[PDB]
Amino acid sequence: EIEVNSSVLNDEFIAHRLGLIPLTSERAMSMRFSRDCDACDGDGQCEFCSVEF
Amino acid sequence: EVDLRDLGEPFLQSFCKKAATSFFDEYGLVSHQLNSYNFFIEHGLQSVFESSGEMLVEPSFDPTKNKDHEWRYATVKFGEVSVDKPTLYSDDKELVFLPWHARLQNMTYSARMKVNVDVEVFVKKVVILSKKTQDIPIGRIPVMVKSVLCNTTEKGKNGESYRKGECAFDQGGYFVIKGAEKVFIAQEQICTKRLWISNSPWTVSYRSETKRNRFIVRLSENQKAEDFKRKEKVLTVYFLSTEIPVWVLFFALGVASDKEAVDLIAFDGGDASITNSVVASIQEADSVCEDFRHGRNALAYVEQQIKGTKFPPGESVDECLSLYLFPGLKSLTQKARFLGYMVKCLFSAYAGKRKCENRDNFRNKRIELAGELLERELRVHLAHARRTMTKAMQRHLTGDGDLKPIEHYLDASIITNGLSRAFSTGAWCHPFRKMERVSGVVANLGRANPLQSLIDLRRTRQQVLYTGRVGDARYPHPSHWGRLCFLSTPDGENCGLVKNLSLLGLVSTQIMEPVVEELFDSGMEELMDDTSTPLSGKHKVLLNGDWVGVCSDSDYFVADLKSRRRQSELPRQMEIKLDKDDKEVRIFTDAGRLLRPLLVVENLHKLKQSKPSKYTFEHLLDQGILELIGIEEEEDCTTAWGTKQLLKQQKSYTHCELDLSFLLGVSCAIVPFANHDHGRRVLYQSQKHCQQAIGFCSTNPNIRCDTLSQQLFYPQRPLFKTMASECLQKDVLFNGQNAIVAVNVHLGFNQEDSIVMNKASLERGMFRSEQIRSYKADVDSKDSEKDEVVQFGKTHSKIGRVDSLDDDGFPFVGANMHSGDIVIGRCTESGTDHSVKLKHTERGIVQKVVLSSNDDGKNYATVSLRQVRSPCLGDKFSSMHGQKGVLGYIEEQENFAFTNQGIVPDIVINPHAFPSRQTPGQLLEAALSKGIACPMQKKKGKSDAYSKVTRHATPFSTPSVDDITDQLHRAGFSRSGNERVYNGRTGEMMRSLIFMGPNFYQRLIHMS
Amino acid sequence: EPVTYVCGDCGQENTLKSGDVIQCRECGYRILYKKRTRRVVQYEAR
Amino acid sequence: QELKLRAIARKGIGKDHAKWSPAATVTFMYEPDIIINEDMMDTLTDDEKIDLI
Amino acid sequence: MIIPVRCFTCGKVIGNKWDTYLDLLQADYTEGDALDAIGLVRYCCRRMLMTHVDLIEKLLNYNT
Ligand SMILES: [Zn+2]
Ligand SMILES: [Zn+2]
Ligand SMILES: [Zn+2]
């Protein structure tokens, strides 16, 4: 979700570069696919999926 | 140093590279457009207006005294013309005017012309405001970008070049006409001021574009064919009528007797047919008039110029008309000699000693750029303005009323509307017949690449005359060598008529500062003032097709003229032509030849003795190491094919070319291995596929409001290098990405010229494009006629879909405009909608909203949508070698064949494409780039191990097979180009070795 | 927020009202971009 | 110029997009069995030895 | 424009290696020695660094 963007790049370029930044995933074998979670239908942070940055 | 070795090939090839990059530093690539427009503004604009003194005879009446011819015959004449820089003429402190204002406001980037007219009508021949007329508005002329009038040129780099109207890729040889970007195409004309020898009626010809009273001499017409007559020379139609025999026009010009007129012609002697022809000429001459008796017995037969003419050439039809033949000649004793020279040329052409004039040999052709075309159009509309003015002066006979001489009669809108319709409609004036129109002139300017603009600014065009044996008008003629391009051309309706100016080509402009007296200092005895016959077999020196003298031992004379030119003592745009067989010297100071520079093989070679680290091009033209050479002069020069080994095998060369890849066009010279492909494939790549590839767009996208701007994300340069791409240093000449290509059979999805990509590579950003489209509308001023008011608003009564529009009538700047919405709310106050709506296939995020206007309030609206596209399963791609396809199958990563390093291809193509289409250049390119990008083992000791690496795939000078294969042996891979893979499904060894390696591919527009 | 249009070379916010001749005040140039207000927008990093 | 946004990470695998694949090189190879003769190698000459090496 | 993260063919992260590449070419190194100094063994990444066109600067100059 972009609130303000006033650079020379565009929104999809920045989102595309953010998608490729590797995050350390050692609790990902114990996390759950977000289509399989009962909670977290609020487009935000959760505890078995959906870490927020 | 006379051996010219010991300063050998790594020095000379380095000098050629430095000279070529200094060439493009000084001249650029739009040099000829700018030079011709600048020359028009500096000289030719004032040169047009000097026409006459504007007499006025006012023929209305003569019954009575108070309407006699007693009101004064007026007089008025033009003086200086002054042209402003273009300003935006608003009241309350007028403003400076820029081309981006003209594009975004839909007006014409034009400047005002002011003329210093003088009028001194004064009553003294009946039976004044020269002052207060300094600045009279006379039309508005448009202005080329980067001209001597455009406001984007006075500051060099970082004073204020950043204005609000710039790109870093733009060089600007275009116009802006009511919001659109126009561009001239170079025309092609015959070289007049030269004798022209036909052969169907044998009619040797003295043309003149000006002075439309000029003649031809025709020998192959007998007037009858009953039994047979001898061929006699009749000096046929002379004043658009009035045939005369040749001998009446001899003794009218004062030849004393015969046997000097035979020595004025001075043919071979013998060859009976010639002397039979001339005695038949005399016998025809005395049959129509008894000539050579008085000063008026022969000159009185020149009589058809009076009444039997249909068009009497002015008043005083007598010896005053003798300055309508040969105005460059000054007295009759030279005009008689030049008539004898014409007849000698005709007789020499009859006996098969002089070949007739081949039209498609480009030394007989002058190219008309923007200067001459503006000359022609402005002369037409100015002549109409003069007639319209003098008809307006006559309505005020014998009563003044409104007499202020200026600003009541001289209407600027005439020339304004004329020059506007010339650019906007394409109704361009024909160069010969001053009533019709021609069309294949000024076009639109492409912007899809920054290479399409370069190709669109460098073009020359042969017209269509009549389709009955055009001859060789669409086939490369050996005079194109080094000047035009013999590989790339369009195909279709105009295949070979539109030609591409080469890299090192240049166009001469004009030579002022007259050079008749400059030739005396090397030879050049002056022409006599009597027939007599003292003229030996000495050579002849013409100047733009004009006898101005006669010299002898011309082998030294032209050597001294070239030596004065190389020491910067004669002007640089002057061709020196020594015809040794016809015994003739031609000197050209002409406007519109084709010039290119060459290495002069000096006998001292200053490069060894001096060696600075800089070479400006003005500096290298002073020492005479380089030299601007035309087409005429070059055929007397034996030029080598490069310093490589070829200027070192002999010393029988007088020049050298810089490098052979500069023979090609701007878009063909950068193709790797370009002399290996079939010619049809290179035509494809260098005319259509380079002009369509998706890549760079601009470096200020906030101002370009045009339909369908497109752009990649990550543009690249190729792994290899060519000569021209290195000397130019524009990485915007390459629009695509370095894909890895493996040739192998896939499951049947890459058949019939179809290609297979990799989904993982597509998901990391590869070939991902981004398009921007603009939607436009308009409404009147504010309230005036100068209801049907369709003022931009909301109209809240829910006509269509208004979820995103604001109160002003336009959406906001983060919207997500859908498949079919309302994009501009152009609705009236009470009636139905006139609002613009999206159609079925346009959608996207709003990028900006631009709202401008015109002088009469015509408010303009601009909305740009943005989209991001990844390449789908229907899109088209191509290599650098005319090898195109359609993406037919997008494959997941773990099913491709992988090498022992784990490398996967990005594009897989079918091996049935190569043995038929004859492009081994793609395989050689893949092997070269694979040998570049790999590391190099055994680097410990004995070398730095990265210095004997070939990166140059220059077209006509290319690396050998042994170089490439020994490089692949040094890099560790197999010498045959192949590579062993394992399968991505069964996992075991595929039996056939696979050819892999990187290749520069391209993505083309018109996606589906 | 209101519309708050921005000029091209002034950079000054004219905050345009109902349709006059399009012309930036404090000058005479006629560019008049539209300012982006403060919203949110959703995107998939794909 | 500024840039305010808020990103939400989730869980996925490499078949949905390339951003979730943690590999960046996974490959294997066989290993050869070379059974070079000694009664043919002593026949041919020393320059031929240093050539075919 | 900017260097792409994730070399398109294999998937190694190269998005941080640009400035050290410019500094190694600035010092005195040729391109082979520079890429062997940063540690890129397979040519799928070497072709991604050697052929990158950096266009962000020309965009930064032409804004206001
Ligand atoms: Zn949850
Ligand atoms: Zn303003
Ligand atoms: Zn890799």
Automatic annotation (TrEMBL), chain A:
Species of the source: Brassica oleracea var. oleracea
Binding site residues for Zn(2+): C37, C40, C46, C49
Compartmental location: Nucleus
Signal sequence, start to end: none
Entry similarity comment: Belongs to the archaeal Rpo3/eukaryotic RPB3 RNA polymerase subunit family.
Full protein name: DNA-directed RNA polymerase RpoA/D/Rpb3-type domain-containing protein
Residues of the full protein shown: 55 to 107 of 319
TrEMBL record, chain C:
GO terms for cellular component: RNA polymerase I complex; RNA polymerase II, core complex; RNA polymerase III complex
Keywords, sorted A to Z: Metal-binding, Nucleus, Zinc
Location of the protein in the cell: Nucleus
InterPro entries per UniProt: RNAP_P/RPABC4, RPABC4, RPABC4/Spt4
Pfam families: Zn_ribbon_RPAB4
SMART domains attached to this UniProt entry: RPOLCX (SM00659)
GO MF assignments: DNA binding; DNA-directed RNA polymerase activity; zinc ion binding
Chain sites annotated for binding Zn(2+): C7, D9, C10, C24
Main localisation: nucleus
Single GO BP term: DNA-templated transcription
SUPFAM superfamilies listed in its UniProt record: RNA polymerase subunits
Homology family: Belongs to the archaeal Rpo12/eukaryotic RPC10 RNA polymerase subunit family.
The protein, known as: Uncharacterized protein
Organism the protein comes from: Brassica oleracea var. oleracea
From TrEMBL, chain E:
SUPFAM superfamilies: RNA polymerase subunit RPB10 (SSF46924)
Gene Ontology terms for molecular function: DNA binding; DNA-directed RNA polymerase activity; zinc ion binding
A Pfam family hit: RNA_pol_N
Gene3D superfamilies, per database record: Homeodomain-like
Keyword Metal-binding included in the entry's annotation: yes
Main subcellular location: nucleus
Residues where Zn(2+) 2 binds: C10, R42
Homology family: Belongs to the archaeal Rpo10/eukaryotic RPB10 RNA polymerase subunit family.
Gene Ontology biological process: transcription by RNA polymerase I; transcription by RNA polymerase II; tRNA transcription by RNA polymerase III
GO terms for cellular component: RNA polymerase I complex; RNA polymerase II, core complex; RNA polymerase III complex
Organism listed in the record: Brassica oleracea var. oleracea
Keywords: DNA-directed RNA polymerase, Metal-binding, Transcription, Zinc
UniProt binding sites for Zn(2+) 1: C7, C10, C44, C45
Descriptive protein name: Uncharacterized protein
InterPro entries cross-referenced by the UniProt entry: RNA_pol_su_RPB10 (IPR023580), RNA_pol_suN_Zn-BS (IPR020789), RPABC5/Rpb10 (IPR000268)
Subcellular location: Nucleus
